Amino acid sequence: AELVASAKAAISQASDVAALDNVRVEYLGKKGHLTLQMTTLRELPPEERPA
Asked: 24: helix, coil or strand?
């Protein structure tokens, strides 16, 4: 997983400076929903198993 776990190096840097903000949390907690819900789908290899 090196074409896609170089996308899981974002889920600790969209957070290395999430906890560094000044007061915007459920704001940023909706951009791990347009950059942290995106890498999710769609998966081919029809989920049985994908795994």
From this structure: coil
50: which residues sit within 8 A by CB, 6+ positions away? 43
Instruction: Give phi and psi for 46, each to the nearest 5.
Output: -20, 80
The set of residues, in sequence order, having a beta carbon less than 8 Å from that of 11 and lying 6+ positions away, is 32, 36
Beta carbons within 8 Å of 7's beta carbon, 6+ residues apart: 39
Is residue 50 within 8 A of residue 25, CB to CB? The reply is no
How many CA atoms are closer than 13 Å to the CA of 39, on its beta-carbon side? 13
Measure the CA–CA gap between 38 and 18, rounded to whole angstroms: 18
